[PDB]
Predict the structure.
Amino acid sequence: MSLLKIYWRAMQYLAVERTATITMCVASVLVALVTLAEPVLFGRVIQSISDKGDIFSPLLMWAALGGFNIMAAVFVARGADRLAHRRRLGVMIDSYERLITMPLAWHQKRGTSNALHTLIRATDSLFTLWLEFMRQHLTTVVALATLIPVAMTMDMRMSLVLIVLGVIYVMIGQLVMRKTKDGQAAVEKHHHKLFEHVSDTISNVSVVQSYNRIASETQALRDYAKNLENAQFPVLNWWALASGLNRMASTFSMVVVLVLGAYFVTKGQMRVGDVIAFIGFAQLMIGRLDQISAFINQTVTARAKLEEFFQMEDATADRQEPENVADLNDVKGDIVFDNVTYEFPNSGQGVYDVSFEVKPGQTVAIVGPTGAGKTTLINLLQRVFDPAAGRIMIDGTDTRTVSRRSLRHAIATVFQDAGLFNRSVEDNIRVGRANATHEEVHAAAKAAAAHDFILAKSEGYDTFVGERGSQLSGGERQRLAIARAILKDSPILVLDEATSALDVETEEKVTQAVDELSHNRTTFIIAHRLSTVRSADLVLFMDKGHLVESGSFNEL
Amino acid sequence: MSLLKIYWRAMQYLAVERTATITMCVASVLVALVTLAEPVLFGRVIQSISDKGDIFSPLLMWAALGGFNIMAAVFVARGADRLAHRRRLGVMIDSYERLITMPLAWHQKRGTSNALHTLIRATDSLFTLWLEFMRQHLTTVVALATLIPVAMTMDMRMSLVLIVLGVIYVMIGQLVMRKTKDGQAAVEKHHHKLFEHVSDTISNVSVVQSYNRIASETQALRDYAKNLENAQFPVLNWWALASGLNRMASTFSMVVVLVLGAYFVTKGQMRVGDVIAFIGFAQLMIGRLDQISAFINQTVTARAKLEEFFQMEDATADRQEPENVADLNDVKGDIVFDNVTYEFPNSGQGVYDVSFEVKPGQTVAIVGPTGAGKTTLINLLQRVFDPAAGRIMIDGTDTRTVSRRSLRHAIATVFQDAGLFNRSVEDNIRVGRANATHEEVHAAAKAAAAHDFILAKSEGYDTFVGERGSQLSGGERQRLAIARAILKDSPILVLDEATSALDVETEEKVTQAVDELSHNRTTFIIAHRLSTVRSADLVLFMDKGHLVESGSFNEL
Ligand SMILES: Nc1ncnc2c1ncn2[C@@H]1O[C@H](COP(=O)(O)OP(=O)(O)O)[C@@H](O)[C@H]1O
Ligand SMILES: Nc1ncnc2c1ncn2[C@@H]1O[C@H](COP(=O)(O)OP(=O)(O)O)[C@@H](O)[C@H]1O
Ligand code: VO4
Ligand code: VO4
């Protein structure tokens, strides 16, 4: 049973706030004892024969106990509520950090939309788990644990009945658990299929709309829903049977305790009222012993998502060394490849047996057939994945002996797909040099021909853009990416298709500025348009992961 | 109070399944009456003086009533559980349909990731609302409604006390409601800000990682979380105060009922036991009257998301006319523009005063400066938004008098950003002609040079691709999009930057096949590379939403 594992992990995640956790535990123990003490007082006061309640009597003890009860209820309802939200925010922040720090392959293979779903439906489940646990469960657990001795002290037969009730509850839970586990695995798989289909279609609404396949897609979703609820029903059937069994056990226990109280007619003590006290005990227990069962149901679902949330956390194998790592500094520019080879997981293709050198001050232009291993070479330079066999040598330092923070600080890149945030243009250019100035932002925009179109439209620089920069067409996105890269001003520069959506005039106007600014550094340009590489100092072309010439600018 | 509105809307959404809803209501009424009848039996049987329970006695009535109670509990726990999931799936399917059918501007301005979040957190809230409502609330509402007459019949003073309890609960709920509403609006706004930031960053992990700003982004998220929980606390404070007040009212009502039962010592009837019966009443009520209050808390949050889910549903203003619309058929190809103008909402730019004509059998190539209103013209042709002033004329038919299904069936397009589904390549090509054959799929792949690279890699055609086609670089995505468009074979063809990521050789090899296949139809090509428009029959260029020449292929 992973219930113990996930509960202990939730406790470990909750143990950071000691100062409040111990207080919550103490208050829970106190309120459990109050809820245990109330029924005994009720049995003592329910005599109603010659009690004379309105003068002192156990009714004053009632008043004091109820006042303490309401005060403790207020304290718990405030403290647990205030703790749960703060701790959920903390867990979300730490998990978001660990999620961002993960490499790109893990994101591409799984994430984009599934990762955020995992985050949200794990943190919300953990929050509800913490809140319900604290209040109801941390009352009831210690409440029953302290109750069973008191039940043993007077009228041990009733304590035996209560023990039988507890054993029956445990047995029925365990019996239901196997079938529910078997069903819930398939249920979770089917739900994942349904959600991934929904996300895939919604994220690509333009294509599904522009091809008249809305009806087909909704029919596919209906089929997925039918598949999901086809295997869903047995789980609900078994849970309902469990509810029936525990309710029947509760009814039988009530019958037993009433009959035993009646049979004690021979032992005519004051228990004429105290029996009612025991009744409350059972009542109390039964009510609480129901609240856990449905609770268990919740976690039997939650497990699924929680498991992923832990499989991510245990996957914190990223370690750039605490201090043994030597952050590379004072970059001059010297790129050397040593027999670099890469095989994609469960696939072919990838660069094979490449070795070339780059001297400082000169630019390198990779051309050739499409899909021939250019983007993979470029992102091998930035080390988004470690080459399987071979070395990448930077100015007398191996790349695998360099901190990630230092390596990517000296490499400024424009990707093939210019990614953008939906913030303002000012912020989208500020993600270069962090806090240089506004004048340099203006200059960088001017250099990449980004100032001309933006100085006279839509509230100036403080202009919002839509998701993935959907409000600036395609070419303007390329201009903003180029301006950002130029503003970062790193010794190593990369431009993967910098002129994918620019006409000839803007292409020339941008490339001349890029050359003027980058002549002091080393840059790579990946393009099929040979016009932009007229100033290239090392022109090379590679076909299907294999070099051909790797010669100078002018060669045949 | 929108509580009545949203509850009535949930009921209307639940009224489709009449055959099961009426059964659930009947069972709820029955179990409410059973829960009302039990305490009276308890008061009658708790005498324990000369009852002689083990021979007949009210204990047999206990046994029968408890058996009916457990049977009804099983029936409700099965029926409500089976109903809720099926109805949630139905609501999700219908809302997904309405979401897909909405226009592109609404998606771009808001959706991609927020729309799916709205869907999921609205449907899950509705599901939990339905389940909790049915079981607990549709028991307790009619239970109390039928209880208050019985309380009035015997010992009207206790009924008065119960009425006072109910009035106090209503008053404290209403008092808490104003402050909770004021807080929850700001809380929801802040949560939306936090989630949009998280989604924006996660969806763009490559850029945030490649610029060493993970620390800055997590600090921004921490600041957002601090802002969210800064205004969160007063809501929890007020809710805890409400819990304290209702618990105090419950305790006072218990004191009142016990004291009144004691004062009835003068009226020495059998009520010596029946008073205990009333106690259970109060007990019952109090417990149930607590379950609603926290329930209300839930919906006070849920409202926010639910409101959006209704604002979407009420926004079903899309109507292509049921039958008055005339689906355009037998397309020959004749595109005419009539003074078409467009102003973007709260922005400048857009095509101004355009009018041109297209004859069948000839192709039209739009060139010119970047960001000059080309993509907007093309998507005006497909009518993703209605021109503000002007007409689009297709073969003697106005476009606004044409069904959307018929119009986009005759126009096959490759977008500037070639969108792809993460299904196999076979499925990504099957979204053209729906069920033509496999041989024509192979031929279409061969024509667009997509067969050569794929015949010998990664399990053939049945090759999965990642999210947004991340597993095929960029150029292969363009080839797949071109192959899809060619396979659809529509009389009107559009190619927005069909050679954005192809070298010269593949560009020629693809454009010759495209020309050979499309010479029988009319096509538009939007490109800054003049090589692909060597066969263009109508070359025109437009600058900042204004035409210049609109001449033939050869002009100066
Ligand atoms: N995540 C991946 N999984 C499998 N194959 C991949 C993946 N990424 C790239 N490839 C393969 O690597 C080849 C080259 O990719 P890439 O370098 O991105 O394109 P280009 O060669 O045009 O720069 C492609 O043919 C593609 O099939
Ligand atoms: N959703 C939008 N909101 C505001 N402005 C837009 C939007 N979409 C496009 N524009 C403006 O319209 C102009 C032309 O856009 P578009 O036609 O997509 O590019 P192109 O002219 O290169 O085809 C751009 O300069 C852009 O500023
Ligand atoms: O629609 V473009 O920005 O490729 O001219
Ligand atoms: O598919 V490419 O990386 O040659 O633009």
User: Anything to note?
Assistant: Residues 80 and 134 of chain B are 7 Å apart (CA to CA). The radius of gyration of chain B is 35 Å.
